[PDB]
Design a protein around this ligand. Structure first.
Ligand SMILES: [Ca+2]
Ligand SMILES: [Ca+2]
Ligand SMILES: [Ca+2]
Ligand SMILES: [Ca+2]
Ligand SMILES: [Ca+2]
Ligand SMILES: [Ca+2]
Ligand SMILES: [Ca+2]
Ligand SMILES: [Ca+2]
Ligand SMILES: [Mn+2]
Ligand SMILES: [Mn+2]
Ligand SMILES: [Mn+2]
Ligand SMILES: [Mn+2]
Ligand SMILES: [Zn+2]
Ligand SMILES: [Zn+2]
Ligand SMILES: [Zn+2]
Ligand SMILES: [Zn+2]
Lengths: 241, 241, 241, 241
């Protein structure tokens, strides 16, 4: 039908002066047509104590006073390399208040999203490369759903492939009120995580969507090779079933 | 992930991708008339017609790979008196399903009696027949191998207005939902827990059915779209809207 | 292949993904009123308004990588007399473009005079002004850096009916096309050979503009969608419909 | 908008008894979830003098008496292996009259599509593995647009990769009246070919879409790993610009 508001963007390539991206922290574009979320040295080696994010310029309308909530899909391809086989801390796809910025000291385990481990409102999927078991991480690389806290509401084990290009697929289904992620490498296993959450209880009506990454003492390239996003809001739709 | 999607926003005479049974015709004002109408727009009694999409739908493969699906249609039910009958149904059947003998009126072109082919239907039931187990108002109903609905919702049907019907089958949570709506009115919604891979064969046809009996109405379809995704039941459904 | 797509089928007050300039407002009956209307639905003279999508559009990258694009909008132009003015335009500008001084009436909110910002527009011109080079009937026109159209087609505009406008830029063949249509009427169509990567900057905003002067009309937008694909000019465009 | 007829199918996997595919000649499904268009021996070696095709079951509506023509996209992934480095004869995506069958003696250079080299109406894109310069092939592997004749209207050189999975992307744009193909391997060059042709001059109003392959004296696996098709027809659209 014809009763739907929608936003779609796709980057298969990033250049210098990517005017439709807001870059925060150490994030740069247009090195080999990639988005580097964390600082990489002149020789290609990642740096510690780094944090960076890229947000799409247009705000996204995610719910309305009718309790009608947008459905959305995000897809990105990433390259995490750690030459020392000591990677940290990971990549996140997030949804935030529109004027959200990098919280003070959100390097390392806090992934550029949270100021502490329990100002800004965050819903994220984490690709978490480093287990911090003292803040509820399982004791392995994992994907997680983060609702207003780095202490994931749900996690699944993630067999991350040092130096391989992987794909993350984020799905919000507003019929089911379910946030899900699938992370995969070619000719390898997929990891998946789901969590039931109505975003009209959690986020503002208007948000920005972004990618965030951090390093700490340990470090990794947090390289994004492509990023696509689609959001659909049908204002005259039944808000729940 | 195997997929089928079709969309009719216009019908023509000789619609080669539809199987028309009974009194069904396509092309009059670009519409599908499931039941007999006179040249003047007068609907006839004792009429039954169905339209099936020509292509069979792969509705399950294994315990891991099953099909989520969605159907939408827009309809115009009109009678010259206060007493329209008998209604419109969206159905999934065995691929070689035909109209059962005497299935006019209350049996909606789907069932030989009120308790052969395997039928799962969502019924837009305009006429309450209390002796075959209808509630005593017009209703939307989920029918699993029987005209006696497993679950119904009251339907405030508007004689002579264009309505929208939206059917959702979630193969992960095992839930069949229907929403029916007119402009500026609250929707009717019904949901029922049913694993369709235990009821239906591997291959199905999907269709629209409609009937009149003693009482009569136009059973005019203005549009009909359908999407089926045969996929892992470990991965979450992407919403359509 | 970088892509942007948006679709408005409904506008709200505080549409954060639109930049409103001049007299433009959003939300009255879920519509975008580009020019001033009274509470009773009476359009005012000497009015000008534009809506720009918040996100900038990457319209070329290199001699190999350039953007094909498509825009559709639906509009209601209504006056109480036989004499509506001055019309609606779809435009591409430099990203920080604002309404030029005195651009009401015949200049359509796009141009300071009839021969600053870089403007490329498709004009739905409701009022023939022969001294700034309009033909002597209502027309659709392609405007490249000038209100004096490079090419026009006669437009049989229907006061008080909902029209559809469809703009296509083919970056391979270097051709800017517009089609305007009402239900049950023949379309008006105009095409013009122009390499937009020689006229426009690398980054643009896209927008709708409208004006009234001495004579007046409603400049109501009911929907607006846009797709831009920045891709190799060795590969063929995929049509939208 | 809401004025479009559409058909979409996607196969990422083929099983035995693929009821929505018509198989012709030597074509089989459900060996390693693949479609084998030509005969492969029990040990995995391709056979000579083989021809086979797979057609989608639902007919596709490609034009109307208004001269409105469908736009369409087809994508497939294929594996051509010849252990002897002597491959023939190739794969084609085609569009035919609905009841089209394999012409007598269409093995080898005739690709399962034509009865001779100058009953059925064919438009095809060929992935031609074997140069027959006496019927106008260039003297290398090439992609070709075939309008009612194996003597390609347009060809481009194709650097085919023995034993690699490749992707073919077929585009018909009805705005441009242009049939195009792109053929690619991962981390390798793309080959592209285009030809201007209005299909309402060439095909029936209703068609089937298919894949065809042949071997001759020389042979290759003609393995299809995935196949997707989308066709859109907007009946109230301007038929040409
Ligand atoms: Ca961690
Ligand atoms: Ca099976
Ligand atoms: Ca009944
Ligand atoms: Ca719905
Ligand atoms: Ca540039
Ligand atoms: Ca004028
Ligand atoms: Ca159009
Ligand atoms: Ca050949
Ligand atoms: Mn974690
Ligand atoms: Mn009932
Ligand atoms: Mn003009
Ligand atoms: Mn050839
Ligand atoms: Zn809610
Ligand atoms: Zn089941
Ligand atoms: Zn150019
Ligand atoms: Zn034609």
């Amino acid at each position: 039908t014809h009763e739907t508001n929608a936003l779609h963007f796709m980057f298969n390539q990033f250049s210098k002066d990517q005017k439709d991206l807001i870059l925060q922290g150490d994030a740069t574009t247009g090195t080999d047509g990639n988005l580097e979320l964390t600082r990489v040295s002149s020789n290609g080696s990642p740096q510690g104590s780094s944090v960076g994010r890229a947000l799409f310029y247009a705000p996204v309308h995610i719910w309305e006073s009718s309790a009608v909530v947008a459905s959305f899909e995000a897809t990105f391809t990433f390259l995490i390399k750690s030459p020392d086989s000591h990677p940290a801390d990971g990549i996140a796809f997030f949804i935030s208040n529109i004027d959200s910025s990098i919280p003070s000291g959100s390097t390392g385990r806090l992934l550029g999203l949270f100021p502490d481990a329990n100002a800004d409102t965050i819903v994220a999927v984490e690709l978490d490369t480093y287990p911090n078991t003292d803040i509820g991480d399982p004791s392995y690389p994992h994907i997680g759903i983060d609702i207003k806290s780095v202490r994931s509401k749900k996690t699944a084990k993630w067999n991350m492939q040092n130096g391989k290009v992987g794909t993350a697929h984020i799905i919000y289904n507003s019929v089911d009120k379910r946030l899900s992620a699938v992370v995969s490498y070619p000719n390898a296993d997929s990891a998946t995580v789901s969590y039931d959450v109505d975003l009209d209880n959690v986020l503002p009506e208007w948000v920005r969507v972004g990618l965030s990454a951090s390093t700490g003492l340990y470090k990794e390239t947090n390289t994004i090779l492509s990023w696509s996003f689609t959001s659909k809001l049908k204002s005259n739709e039944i808000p729940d079933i």
